[PDB]
Design an enzyme around this catalytic site. Sequence first.
Site, PDB file in Angstrom:
ATOM      1  NE  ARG A 247      -3.772   0.533   0.115  1.00 25.03           N
ATOM      2  CZ  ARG A 247      -4.886   0.694   0.816  1.00 25.03           C
ATOM      3  NH1 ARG A 247      -5.484  -0.348   1.406  1.00 25.03           N
ATOM      4  NH2 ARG A 247      -5.416   1.899   0.910  1.00 25.03           N
TER       5      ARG A 247
ATOM      6  CB  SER B  66       4.588 -14.912  -8.760  1.00 20.85           C
ATOM      7  OG  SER B  66       3.383 -15.349  -9.405  1.00 20.85           O
TER       8      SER B  66
ATOM      9  NE  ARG C  52       2.156   0.352   6.886  1.00 23.18           N
ATOM     10  CZ  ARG C  52       0.922  -0.100   6.708  1.00 23.18           C
ATOM     11  NH1 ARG C  52       0.279  -0.709   7.706  1.00 23.18           N
ATOM     12  NH2 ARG C  52       0.315   0.058   5.535  1.00 23.18           N
TER      13      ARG C  52
HETATM   14  C1  LIG Z   1       0.797 -10.803 -15.859  1.00 22.52           C
HETATM   15  C2  LIG Z   1       1.565  -9.997 -14.845  1.00 22.52           C
HETATM   16  C3  LIG Z   1       2.557 -10.662 -14.121  1.00 22.52           C
HETATM   17  C4  LIG Z   1       3.144 -10.077 -13.009  1.00 22.52           C
HETATM   18  N1  LIG Z   1       4.133 -10.765 -12.304  1.00 22.52           N
HETATM   19  C5  LIG Z   1       4.715 -10.204 -11.175  1.00 22.52           C
HETATM   20  C6  LIG Z   1       5.705 -10.874 -10.427  1.00 22.52           C
HETATM   21  O1  LIG Z   1       5.962 -12.066 -10.584  1.00 22.52           O
HETATM   22  N2  LIG Z   1       6.237 -10.262  -9.313  1.00 22.52           N
HETATM   23  C7  LIG Z   1       5.826  -8.987  -8.950  1.00 22.52           C
HETATM   24  O2  LIG Z   1       6.301  -8.429  -7.976  1.00 22.52           O
HETATM   25  N3  LIG Z   1       4.871  -8.329  -9.681  1.00 22.52           N
HETATM   26  C8  LIG Z   1       4.310  -8.918 -10.789  1.00 22.52           C
HETATM   27  N4  LIG Z   1       3.328  -8.221 -11.488  1.00 22.52           N
HETATM   28  C9  LIG Z   1       3.037  -6.800 -11.079  1.00 22.52           C
HETATM   29  C10 LIG Z   1       3.690  -5.787 -12.027  1.00 22.52           C
HETATM   30  O3  LIG Z   1       5.094  -5.876 -11.923  1.00 22.52           O
HETATM   31  C11 LIG Z   1       3.289  -4.349 -11.705  1.00 22.52           C
HETATM   32  O4  LIG Z   1       3.842  -3.987 -10.462  1.00 22.52           O
HETATM   33  C12 LIG Z   1       1.786  -4.083 -11.610  1.00 22.52           C
HETATM   34  O5  LIG Z   1       1.082  -4.679 -12.680  1.00 22.52           O
HETATM   35  C13 LIG Z   1       1.559  -2.575 -11.625  1.00 22.52           C
HETATM   36  O6  LIG Z   1       1.640  -2.098 -12.949  1.00 22.52           O
HETATM   37  P1  LIG Z   1       2.761  -1.030 -13.373  1.00 22.52           P
HETATM   38  O7  LIG Z   1       4.130  -1.588 -13.164  1.00 22.52           O
HETATM   39  O8  LIG Z   1       2.611  -0.611 -14.787  1.00 22.52           O
HETATM   40  O9  LIG Z   1       2.772   0.182 -12.352  1.00 22.52           O
HETATM   41  P2  LIG Z   1       1.556   1.183 -12.047  1.00 22.52           P
HETATM   42  O10 LIG Z   1       1.624   1.343 -10.575  1.00 22.52           O
HETATM   43  O11 LIG Z   1       0.313   0.600 -12.612  1.00 22.52           O
HETATM   44  O12 LIG Z   1       2.026   2.584 -12.714  1.00 22.52           O
HETATM   45  C14 LIG Z   1       1.517   3.059 -13.946  1.00 22.52           C
HETATM   46  C15 LIG Z   1       2.699   3.621 -14.710  1.00 22.52           C
HETATM   47  O13 LIG Z   1       3.330   4.594 -13.902  1.00 22.52           O
HETATM   48  C16 LIG Z   1       4.736   4.510 -14.037  1.00 22.52           C
HETATM   49  N5  LIG Z   1       5.346   4.312 -12.706  1.00 22.52           N
HETATM   50  C17 LIG Z   1       4.681   4.076 -11.526  1.00 22.52           C
HETATM   51  N6  LIG Z   1       5.582   4.011 -10.515  1.00 22.52           N
HETATM   52  C18 LIG Z   1       6.811   4.208 -11.044  1.00 22.52           C
HETATM   53  C19 LIG Z   1       8.078   4.232 -10.476  1.00 22.52           C
HETATM   54  N7  LIG Z   1       8.218   4.228  -9.154  1.00 22.52           N
HETATM   55  N8  LIG Z   1       9.166   4.476 -11.273  1.00 22.52           N
HETATM   56  C20 LIG Z   1       9.023   4.670 -12.629  1.00 22.52           C
HETATM   57  N9  LIG Z   1       7.766   4.649 -13.196  1.00 22.52           N
HETATM   58  C21 LIG Z   1       6.675   4.412 -12.415  1.00 22.52           C
HETATM   59  C22 LIG Z   1       5.030   3.401 -15.024  1.00 22.52           C
HETATM   60  O14 LIG Z   1       5.064   4.000 -16.303  1.00 22.52           O
HETATM   61  C23 LIG Z   1       3.780   2.576 -14.930  1.00 22.52           C
HETATM   62  O15 LIG Z   1       3.541   1.888 -16.127  1.00 22.52           O
HETATM   63  C24 LIG Z   1       2.741  -8.802 -12.611  1.00 22.52           C
HETATM   64  C25 LIG Z   1       1.741  -8.130 -13.331  1.00 22.52           C
HETATM   65  C26 LIG Z   1       1.147  -8.718 -14.443  1.00 22.52           C
HETATM   66  C27 LIG Z   1      -0.042  -8.013 -15.059  1.00 22.52           C
HETATM   67  C1  LIG Z   2      -2.465   1.804  11.240  1.00 24.62           C
HETATM   68  C2  LIG Z   2      -2.943   1.991   9.815  1.00 24.62           C
HETATM   69  C3  LIG Z   2      -4.256   1.611   9.535  1.00 24.62           C
HETATM   70  C4  LIG Z   2      -4.706   1.503   8.216  1.00 24.62           C
HETATM   71  N1  LIG Z   2      -6.017   1.131   7.956  1.00 24.62           N
HETATM   72  C5  LIG Z   2      -6.485   1.009   6.667  1.00 24.62           C
HETATM   73  C6  LIG Z   2      -7.794   0.609   6.396  1.00 24.62           C
HETATM   74  O1  LIG Z   2      -8.546   0.266   7.311  1.00 24.62           O
HETATM   75  N2  LIG Z   2      -8.214   0.487   5.076  1.00 24.62           N
HETATM   76  C7  LIG Z   2      -7.332   0.770   4.037  1.00 24.62           C
HETATM   77  O2  LIG Z   2      -7.660   0.683   2.853  1.00 24.62           O
HETATM   78  N3  LIG Z   2      -6.048   1.162   4.316  1.00 24.62           N
HETATM   79  C8  LIG Z   2      -5.609   1.276   5.614  1.00 24.62           C
HETATM   80  N4  LIG Z   2      -4.305   1.640   5.861  1.00 24.62           N
HETATM   81  C9  LIG Z   2      -3.439   2.000   4.697  1.00 24.62           C
HETATM   82  C10 LIG Z   2      -3.209   3.512   4.640  1.00 24.62           C
HETATM   83  O3  LIG Z   2      -4.409   4.187   4.372  1.00 24.62           O
HETATM   84  C11 LIG Z   2      -2.264   3.867   3.505  1.00 24.62           C
HETATM   85  O4  LIG Z   2      -2.838   3.449   2.289  1.00 24.62           O
HETATM   86  C12 LIG Z   2      -0.903   3.207   3.643  1.00 24.62           C
HETATM   87  O5  LIG Z   2      -0.457   3.290   4.985  1.00 24.62           O
HETATM   88  C13 LIG Z   2       0.071   3.900   2.700  1.00 24.62           C
HETATM   89  O6  LIG Z   2       0.569   5.047   3.332  1.00 24.62           O
HETATM   90  P1  LIG Z   2       0.337   6.515   2.713  1.00 24.62           P
HETATM   91  O7  LIG Z   2      -1.133   6.826   2.650  1.00 24.62           O
HETATM   92  O8  LIG Z   2       1.053   7.553   3.497  1.00 24.62           O
HETATM   93  O9  LIG Z   2       0.757   6.553   1.199  1.00 24.62           O
HETATM   94  P2  LIG Z   2       2.126   6.159   0.480  1.00 24.62           P
HETATM   95  O10 LIG Z   2       1.629   5.339  -0.676  1.00 24.62           O
HETATM   96  O11 LIG Z   2       3.082   5.536   1.452  1.00 24.62           O
HETATM   97  O12 LIG Z   2       2.708   7.536  -0.080  1.00 24.62           O
HETATM   98  C14 LIG Z   2       3.565   8.331   0.706  1.00 24.62           C
HETATM   99  C15 LIG Z   2       3.067   9.766   0.617  1.00 24.62           C
HETATM  100  O13 LIG Z   2       2.895  10.109  -0.744  1.00 24.62           O
HETATM  101  C16 LIG Z   2       1.751  10.916  -0.928  1.00 24.62           C
HETATM  102  N5  LIG Z   2       0.849  10.281  -1.898  1.00 24.62           N
HETATM  103  C17 LIG Z   2       0.991   9.038  -2.476  1.00 24.62           C
HETATM  104  N6  LIG Z   2      -0.041   8.853  -3.331  1.00 24.62           N
HETATM  105  C18 LIG Z   2      -0.822   9.948  -3.311  1.00 24.62           C
HETATM  106  C19 LIG Z   2      -1.998  10.289  -3.975  1.00 24.62           C
HETATM  107  N7  LIG Z   2      -2.470   9.529  -4.968  1.00 24.62           N
HETATM  108  N8  LIG Z   2      -2.569  11.520  -3.720  1.00 24.62           N
HETATM  109  C20 LIG Z   2      -2.008  12.403  -2.836  1.00 24.62           C
HETATM  110  N9  LIG Z   2      -0.854  12.052  -2.166  1.00 24.62           N
HETATM  111  C21 LIG Z   2      -0.274  10.853  -2.407  1.00 24.62           C
HETATM  112  C22 LIG Z   2       1.119  11.101   0.438  1.00 24.62           C
HETATM  113  O14 LIG Z   2       1.654  12.315   0.904  1.00 24.62           O
HETATM  114  C23 LIG Z   2       1.714   9.994   1.277  1.00 24.62           C
HETATM  115  O15 LIG Z   2       1.866  10.414   2.610  1.00 24.62           O
HETATM  116  C24 LIG Z   2      -3.830   1.759   7.164  1.00 24.62           C
HETATM  117  C25 LIG Z   2      -2.504   2.149   7.444  1.00 24.62           C
HETATM  118  C26 LIG Z   2      -2.059   2.264   8.762  1.00 24.62           C
HETATM  119  C27 LIG Z   2      -0.587   2.457   8.988  1.00 24.62           C
HETATM  120  O1  LIG Z   3      -2.828  -1.503   9.485  1.00 27.85           O
HETATM  121  C1  LIG Z   3      -3.240  -1.576   8.298  1.00 27.85           C
HETATM  122  N1  LIG Z   3      -2.381  -1.498   7.273  1.00 27.85           N
HETATM  123  C2  LIG Z   3      -2.780  -1.574   5.979  1.00 27.85           C
HETATM  124  O2  LIG Z   3      -1.924  -1.485   5.060  1.00 27.85           O
HETATM  125  N2  LIG Z   3      -4.142  -1.760   5.659  1.00 27.85           N
HETATM  126  C3  LIG Z   3      -4.568  -1.872   4.255  1.00 27.85           C
HETATM  127  C4  LIG Z   3      -3.984  -3.138   3.621  1.00 27.85           C
HETATM  128  C5  LIG Z   3      -5.120  -3.749   2.812  1.00 27.85           C
HETATM  129  O3  LIG Z   3      -5.129  -3.150   1.501  1.00 27.85           O
HETATM  130  C6  LIG Z   3      -6.349  -3.305   3.578  1.00 27.85           C
HETATM  131  C7  LIG Z   3      -6.791  -4.338   4.640  1.00 27.85           C
HETATM  132  O4  LIG Z   3      -5.695  -4.612   5.527  1.00 27.85           O
HETATM  133  P1  LIG Z   3      -5.801  -5.609   6.791  1.00 27.85           P
HETATM  134  O5  LIG Z   3      -6.551  -6.793   6.350  1.00 27.85           O
HETATM  135  O6  LIG Z   3      -4.392  -6.070   7.106  1.00 27.85           O
HETATM  136  O7  LIG Z   3      -6.546  -4.876   7.873  1.00 27.85           O
HETATM  137  O8  LIG Z   3      -5.982  -2.043   4.151  1.00 27.85           O
HETATM  138  C8  LIG Z   3      -5.068  -1.838   6.664  1.00 27.85           C
HETATM  139  C9  LIG Z   3      -4.679  -1.739   8.006  1.00 27.85           C
HETATM  140 BR1  LIG Z   3      -5.967  -1.792   9.413  1.00 27.85          BR
END
Ligand SMILES: Cc1cc2nc3c(=O)[nH]c(=O)nc-3n(C[C@H](O)[C@H](O)[C@H](O)COP(=O)(O)OP(=O)(O)OC[C@H]3O[C@@H](n4cnc5c(N)ncnc54)[C@H](O)[C@@H]3O)c2cc1C
Ligand SMILES: Cc1cc2nc3c(=O)[nH]c(=O)nc-3n(C[C@H](O)[C@H](O)[C@H](O)COP(=O)(O)OP(=O)(O)OC[C@H]3O[C@@H](n4cnc5c(N)ncnc54)[C@H](O)[C@@H]3O)c2cc1C
Ligand SMILES: O=c1[nH]c(=O)n([C@H]2C[C@H](O)[C@@H](COP(=O)(O)O)O2)cc1Br
Lengths: 245, 242, 242, 245
Positions: B93, B103, B197
Site C-alpha cells: 500500500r 509469485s 509502521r
Molecule cells: C501478468 C503480470 C505478471 C506479473 N508478475 C509479477 C511478479 O511475478 N512479481 C511482482 O512483484 N509483480 C508482478 N506483477 C506486477 C507488475 O510488476 C506491476 O507492479 C503491476 O502490474 C503494476 O503495474 P505497473 O508496473 O505498470 O505500475 P503502475 O503502478 O500501474 O504505474 C503506472 C505507470 O506509472 C509509471 N510508474 C509508476 N511508478 C513508477 C516508479 N516508481 N518508477 C518509474 N515509473 C513508475 C510506469 O510508467 C507505470 O507503467 C505482474 C503483473 C502482471 C499483469
Molecule cells: C495503522 C494503519 C491503519 C490503516 N487502515 C487502513 C484501512 O482500514 N483500510 C485501508 O484501505 N487502508 C488502511 N491503511 C493503509 C493507509 O491508508 C495507507 O494506504 C498506507 O499506509 C500507505 O501510506 P500513505 O497513505 O502515506 O501513502 P504512500 O503510498 O506511502 O505515499 C507516501 C506519501 O505520498 C503521498 N501520496 C501518495 N499517493 C498519493 C496520492 N495519490 N494523492 C495524494 N498524495 C499521495 C502522500 O503524501 C503519502 O503520505 C492503514 C494504514 C495504517 C498504517
Molecule cells: O494496518 C493496516 N495497514 C494496511 O496497510 N491496511 C490496508 C492493507 C489492505 O489493503 C487493507 C486491509 O488490511 P488488513 O486486512 O491487514 O486490515 O488495508 C489496513 C490496516 Br488496518
Amino acid sequence: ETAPLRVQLIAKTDFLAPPDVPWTTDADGGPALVEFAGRACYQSWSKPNPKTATNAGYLRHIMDVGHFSVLEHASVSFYITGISRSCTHELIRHRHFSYSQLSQRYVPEKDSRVVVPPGMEDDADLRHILTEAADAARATYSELLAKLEAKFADQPNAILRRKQARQAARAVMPNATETRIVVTGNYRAWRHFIAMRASEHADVEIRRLAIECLRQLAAVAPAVFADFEVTTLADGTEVATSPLA
Amino acid sequence: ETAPLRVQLIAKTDFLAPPDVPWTTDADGGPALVEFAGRACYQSWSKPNPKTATNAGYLRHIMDVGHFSVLEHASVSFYITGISRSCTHELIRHRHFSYSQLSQRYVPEKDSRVVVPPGMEDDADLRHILTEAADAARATYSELLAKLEAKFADQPNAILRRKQARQAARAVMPNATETRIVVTGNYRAWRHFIAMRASEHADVEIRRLAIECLRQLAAVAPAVFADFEVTTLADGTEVATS
Amino acid sequence: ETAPLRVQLIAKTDFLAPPDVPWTTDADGGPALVEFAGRACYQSWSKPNPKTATNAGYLRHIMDVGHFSVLEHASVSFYITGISRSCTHELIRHRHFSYSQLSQRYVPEKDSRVVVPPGMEDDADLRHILTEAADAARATYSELLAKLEAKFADQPNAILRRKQARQAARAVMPNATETRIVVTGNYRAWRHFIAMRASEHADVEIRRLAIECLRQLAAVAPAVFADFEVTTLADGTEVATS
Amino acid sequence: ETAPLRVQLIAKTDFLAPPDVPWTTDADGGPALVEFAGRACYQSWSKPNPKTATNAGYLRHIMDVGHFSVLEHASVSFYITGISRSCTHELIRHRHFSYSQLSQRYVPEKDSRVVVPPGMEDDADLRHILTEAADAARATYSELLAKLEAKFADQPNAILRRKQARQAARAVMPNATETRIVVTGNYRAWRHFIAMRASEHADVEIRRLAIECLRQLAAVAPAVFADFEVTTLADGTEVATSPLA
Ligand SMILES: Cc1cc2nc3c(=O)[nH]c(=O)nc-3n(C[C@H](O)[C@H](O)[C@H](O)COP(=O)(O)OP(=O)(O)OC[C@H]3O[C@@H](n4cnc5c(N)ncnc54)[C@H](O)[C@@H]3O)c2cc1C
Ligand SMILES: Cc1cc2nc3c(=O)[nH]c(=O)nc-3n(C[C@H](O)[C@H](O)[C@H](O)COP(=O)(O)OP(=O)(O)OC[C@H]3O[C@@H](n4cnc5c(N)ncnc54)[C@H](O)[C@@H]3O)c2cc1C
Ligand SMILES: O=c1[nH]c(=O)n([C@H]2C[C@H](O)[C@@H](COP(=O)(O)O)O2)cc1Br
Ligand SMILES: Cc1cc2nc3c(=O)[nH]c(=O)nc-3n(C[C@H](O)[C@H](O)[C@H](O)COP(=O)(O)OP(=O)(O)OC[C@H]3O[C@@H](n4cnc5c(N)ncnc54)[C@H](O)[C@@H]3O)c2cc1C
Ligand SMILES: Cc1cc2nc3c(=O)[nH]c(=O)nc-3n(C[C@H](O)[C@H](O)[C@H](O)COP(=O)(O)OP(=O)(O)OC[C@H]3O[C@@H](n4cnc5c(N)ncnc54)[C@H](O)[C@@H]3O)c2cc1C
Ligand SMILES: O=c1[nH]c(=O)n([C@H]2C[C@H](O)[C@@H](COP(=O)(O)O)O2)cc1Br
Ligand SMILES: O=c1[nH]c(=O)n([C@H]2C[C@H](O)[C@@H](COP(=O)(O)O)O2)cc1Br
Ligand SMILES: O=c1[nH]c(=O)n([C@H]2C[C@H](O)[C@@H](COP(=O)(O)O)O2)cc1Br
C-alpha cells in the site's frame, strides 16, 4: 556569457548479493540487482537456458516479455548544467524523478549565463540578439533588486528579506537563463524520459539532453538501454527509438 | 515449517562527486549525494565555516529546516524473507516503494513455509493450531492442483496449464503463507514507512519489519535516521518515534 | 499589458451512493464519497455514534485520527490564469497533481501579458521598469521569430517551421510572462499544497494562489479544509496554517 | 457463503465550463473536462475543424496523436465486492489508484464469504473442496480468536485486545476470503489497468474484474475507451485489446 550543456553522472546503484541465495551473475551494481529482483519473483536461481544465462541475456528477455517494473530497483543521478529554464520547465513535468534545482529566489543573477537554443547555435547574428537581450534583462534585474532590497529592509531575517527582493527581481530573467539541476530516476523512469524526449516531437533542447542521458546510461547499464537506437535526422539532430517503447 | 523474519540490505547508492565542482565532504554514498543535491540549490559549494563543514551537520540542518525532497536522491534496497502474505498486503500500500515479489501464480507452493504472528510466538499450543491448519491447507492445495490440471487437459501448453491450475489452487493458501520480496525506496520514503509502521497503531508483524529496516538504515545513514528513537512497549514489542 | 490572478473551479467529484448499502448521509459530492470510503474499511454503515453521525463530524474524525488516505477519493480541478511562468515552474514540482498548460512551443506569443510580482504591485516605479523590460523582450522576440522563420525556410512542413522558430524565439521571454493552467488534485494533494505554499517561507505569488485555492476548496468541502487558519502578516500578505 | 463479483460505479467527474472562456461543447462531465484541458494547451477555443469541432471528434484526435496526460483530469470511482484477497493483492500493485479496503484487523470474519476462482466455478466437486476448506479455516479462526483474547486478557483496553487477537487470528484465513474495496483512478490510470489486466497473461479473476470496469467505463466515456475491443477466448473468458496505450 553562454553555457554549454554538461551532463555529469554522480550516482549509481551498489549491489551486494545475499550470501545464502544460490545464484551468481555476470555483472555488478544496477544490472545485477535487476536480475536478482526478476529471479526473486520466480525463485529461479539456476540457469538452464544459455541465452538467459548471462546478465545481459536475462535482462533482454525481461524486457522482451514486458516485466518493466523490475527495472525500478536501480537508480542513476546526474548533475546537469547548461540547461535553460524553459528546458527545466519541460523536464520537471516528469513526475517519477526527484529533482534539486538552482533557486532563483536565493542565488545571485549578476554573473548568470544563458543557454543558446540549438536552432540558433550556428548563427552569430541570432546569438548576438539573444545575449544582448540577456544583458539588458540582467541590468534591469540589478536595477529592481537594488530598489527592492531597500523596500524590504524592514524585515529582520536576512534570508527572508533577501528572498523577497530576488524573488520579485527574477521576474525579468529570460527563459534562456542557465539553470543547474540534480535529476535522480530509476531505470524505468529514465527509459520513459528517453522515449518521450529523444524524439522528433520534442523541443530540440530537451531532445539533445535526452540523447546525452541515454549515452551515459548505456555506458553504466548497457543491457538495460541496448534496445534504444540513435539515428541522425536531416538537420543533424539525434533521435532515439526502441521497439519496446 | 516456519520462517523467521530476515531483512538483508542488497543495494544502496554509490556516489561520485563531479571533479569540476569545488566541494568536498567527510562522507560517501547516499549521505554525500544528499548534501551535494542540497548545495546545488544554492550553489553553496564553499565551506568556510569549519564548525558546519560536516556531512552529518548538513543533513541534520536539511531536516530541521524541512527540505525533505533532497532525501529522495539516495536509495536502499532490501531482500525480505519470512514475511507473511497479510504483511505484504499491507506493505505494498506504500506507493513510493518499488517491489518485486514471489509469485504464487508462478511458484509451486507444495513446500511453502508459514509465518507465525508475533502475537502467538510464545504460545506453543497456538503455534500448533497454526501449523496444523497450514498443513491441512497445503494438502487441500495439492488435492486441488491435481484435479485442476486434469480439468485443464484441453490446454496444449504445459507451462500455461500448470499456471492456470496453480492460480486457482492458491485460493486455499492462508494469510500466514511465507512470501519473499525485494523492496526499494529512497530515504524520504523509508522515513515515512518507518513513521507509519513502527507505531503502536500498526500490526505487530509489519511493526517488527519497520523497526528492523530502521536499524539497518540507521547504520547506513546515521544522520538521516538518528531522530527515530526506539522504545520497548509493555508487551515487549518495539515502537519508534521522531 | 498585465494580468490579474484568476482561479476558476471547473470540476469536482459527483457522488452516487450504491443502492444496496444500508447507509445515507447529510452531504453530497466529494465529502459524501470520503465518508463512504472511510466507512467501507470498517463496514460501519449504521451510525451508532451521534457525533460522527453527521458527514462533517465523520470527516473531522478521519483527520484527527490521521486517516488521510481516504481523502484521495475526491478531487477538484481549477483553471488558473494570471499566473507567471516562474510560478508554474514552482507549482509543477508538486508531483501528485495533473496539469494541462499553455504551450509557448505551440501558441504564438503575440500580445502576451505579464504578471506583476505581488512584492512590487504597489510600486508604480517598479511596475514601469518591469513593463518596459517586458516590452523590449517582446520586441526582441518578434525580431528573432522573423529571422528564425527565414532561417528554417527550407523545412517543407510550414506548421513544423513555425514551431521550430517559435520554440527558439521563446528564449527571450521573461519569467513574468503570463501562462494558463488546468490543475487537478485530490483533497489530500490539495491540503499538502496549501500547507507548503500558504506559508511565509513560500514566494508571495504562489502563496496568493494557495490562499485563493484554499478559500474555494473550503467552500466546496468545509470539513476537509476547516483546520486551516488564515492570518494576515505584517506586510499584509496572508498565510494559512493548520 | 460464496460471493459473486459486483462492481458499482459510485463517483465520476462533474464539469462546469468557466463562464468567461469563449467555448462550449456538446458533452458533459469527464469527456468535456478532457477537451477543455486539451484546448487550454493551445488556447484553441474556436472550432475551425468539422473533424474536431465536436467532443467525440476532439477526443478521437487526442487519442490518435497520443497525448494521454489530458485524460488524467477526469476520474471514476467504483465500490467492488465479491473480489478475493489474492485479487486485491494484485490490484493494489497499481500505484496510480487510490484505495480504501475492508480491514481484517478491524472487521470480524467469523461469517466471511469465499470467492470461487473462475477456473473452478463450473465444477461442483472443486467448489465443495473449496467451501469445506474455508469452513475448516473459519473454525480455526474462531478457535484461535478465543484463545488469543484469553492470552491478551492483561490488556485493559478491550478494543485493543480484540484487535490484537483478530490480527493474529486472521493468519489462517485463505486467499479466497472475500474483500471489499473502493478504487479511484483517473481515465489514464484506468486505461493502463485495463491494458495490463484484461489480457491473456493476467489471472482470470482480475481479468474478469478489468473487463467489467472497462464495460462500465466505456458506457460512461465511449470516446475515451472505444479502442478497447472485447474478445472471447476458447475457455469463455474475455480479454480486451487496443492499438493504443
Ligand atoms: C501478468 C503480470 C505478471 C506479473 N508478475 C509479477 C511478479 O511475478 N512479481 C511482482 O512483484 N509483480 C508482478 N506483477 C506486477 C507488475 O510488476 C506491476 O507492479 C503491476 O502490474 C503494476 O503495474 P505497473 O508496473 O505498470 O505500475 P503502475 O503502478 O500501474 O504505474 C503506472 C505507470 O506509472 C509509471 N510508474 C509508476 N511508478 C513508477 C516508479 N516508481 N518508477 C518509474 N515509473 C513508475 C510506469 O510508467 C507505470 O507503467 C505482474 C503483473 C502482471 C499483469
Ligand atoms: C495503522 C494503519 C491503519 C490503516 N487502515 C487502513 C484501512 O482500514 N483500510 C485501508 O484501505 N487502508 C488502511 N491503511 C493503509 C493507509 O491508508 C495507507 O494506504 C498506507 O499506509 C500507505 O501510506 P500513505 O497513505 O502515506 O501513502 P504512500 O503510498 O506511502 O505515499 C507516501 C506519501 O505520498 C503521498 N501520496 C501518495 N499517493 C498519493 C496520492 N495519490 N494523492 C495524494 N498524495 C499521495 C502522500 O503524501 C503519502 O503520505 C492503514 C494504514 C495504517 C498504517
Ligand atoms: O494496518 C493496516 N495497514 C494496511 O496497510 N491496511 C490496508 C492493507 C489492505 O489493503 C487493507 C486491509 O488490511 P488488513 O486486512 O491487514 O486490515 O488495508 C489496513 C490496516 Br488496518
Ligand atoms: C512533445 C510533447 C508535447 C507536449 N505538449 C504539452 C502541452 O501542450 N501542454 C502540457 O501541459 N504538457 C505538454 N507536454 C507534457 C506531457 O503531457 C507530460 O505531462 C510530460 O511529458 C510528462 O510525461 P508523462 O505524461 O508520461 O508523465 P510522467 O510524470 O513522466 O509519468 C510517467 C508515467 O507514469 C504514469 N503516471 C504518472 N502520473 C500519473 C497520474 N497522476 N495518473 C495516472 N498515471 C500517471 C503515466 O503512465 C506516465 O506515462 C508535452 C510533452 C511532449 C513530450
Ligand atoms: C519554500 C520552499 C523552498 C524550496 N526550495 C527548493 C530548492 O531550492 N530547490 C529545489 O529543487 N526545490 C525547492 N523546493 C521544491 C520542493 O523541494 C518540492 O519539490 C516541492 O515543493 C514539491 O513538494 P513535495 O516535495 O512535498 O512533494 P510532492 O511532489 O508535492 O508530493 C507530495 C508528497 O508525496 C510524497 N512523494 C512524492 N514523490 C516522492 C518520491 N519520489 N519519493 C518519496 N516520496 C514522494 C512525499 O511524501 C511528498 O510530501 C522548495 C519548495 C518550498 C515550498
Ligand atoms: O514539448 C513539451 N514539453 C512539455 O513538457 N510541455 C509542458 C511543459 C510546460 O509545463 C507546458 C508548456 O511548455 P512549453 O512552453 O515548453 O511549450 O507544457 C509542453 C510541450 Br509542447
Ligand atoms: O520556493 C520554492 N519553490 C519551488 O518550487 N522551487 C523549485 C522550483 C524550481 O524547480 C526550482 C527553482 O525555483 P525558484 O527559481 O523559483 O527558486 O526549485 C524552489 C523554491 Br526556493
Ligand atoms: O499477475 C500478477 N499480478 C500481480 O499483481 N503480481 C504481484 C502481486 C503480488 O504482490 C505478487 C505475487 O502475486 P501472485 O501471488 O498473485 O502471483 O506479485 C504477480 C502476478 Br504473476
